[PDB]
Design a protein around this nucleic acid. Sequence first.
DNA 1: AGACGGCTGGCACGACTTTTGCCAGATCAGCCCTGG
Length: 259
Amino acid sequence: MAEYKDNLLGEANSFLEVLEQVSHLAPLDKPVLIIGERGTGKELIASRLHYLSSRWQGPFISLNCAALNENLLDSELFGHEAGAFTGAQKRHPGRFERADGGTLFLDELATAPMMVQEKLLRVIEYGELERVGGSQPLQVNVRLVCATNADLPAMVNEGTFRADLLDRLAFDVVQLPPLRERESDIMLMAEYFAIQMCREIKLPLFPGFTERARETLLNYRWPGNIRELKNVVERSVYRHGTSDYPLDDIIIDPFKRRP
DNA sequence: AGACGGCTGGCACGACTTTTGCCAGATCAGCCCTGG
Ligand SMILES: Nc1ncnc2c1ncn2[C@@H]1O[C@H](COP(=O)(O)OP(=O)(O)O)[C@@H](O)[C@H]1O
């Protein structure tokens, strides 16, 4: 293991609590699930669970759920023996078999085709899956790790998620807290971000914030979570222009009329 | 002398031949290293 200084700021305790939980599960072997609001740093957390385990070496496949072809996934997952079907001429490695020793990270697990929810089924349990047209079975020691943003309990009843394919993906959820909740955290990430954008309009230095911005932001409920401060804060800098004086007003929304 | 019929050959269009272009891989057996 190591440290891997990853740009993931904000004390707020809620962050400390999830990090403690996330850090504690780093040496595990059981699949975890991250439930959080869209754009709450879920990506960071996925990636936390690997570069912190006892295999910071293994591979690390992205595995989008809606990124799959679907018609031809029966070989995009396990993958195949060269010559299994017309056209085949070289063995191809399934994502799972890619990811042996490493860990898979299904982005947006909620949005997934029904067919893909069943196929996966046995790749998770035990570790038996043979390539399409394959002559023998094998093993896979790829720890599973995925995170969503849409709630899954409702989905299980709704039938969009197999009632049975739920006990088996999640052994633990790391459920991140909402932006508004952290409220300490505001200020800080703001400021880190300002200077962020400051590097890149070629400018010397960011004068700061007026009280007027203190109020604007804090009053604002942030329903876009981490990006709201970024999209909102970085956008303000463009409007701010000259660095001689500190900015006081930042618009909440790009949408609607300007006069 | 002018029109009609015959002849040949160029060109076109399907039905059909033929000619060129691929590029390993996995699997099995003997020998060397090591455990019993
Ligand atoms: N704790 C944090 N502090 C500062 N910025 C963050 C934090 N977590 C995420 N971000 C930034 O905000 C964006 C939110 O998107 P992302 O992290 O992908 O969330 P999700 O994966 O849930 O969609 C990211 O691009 C990331 O750079």
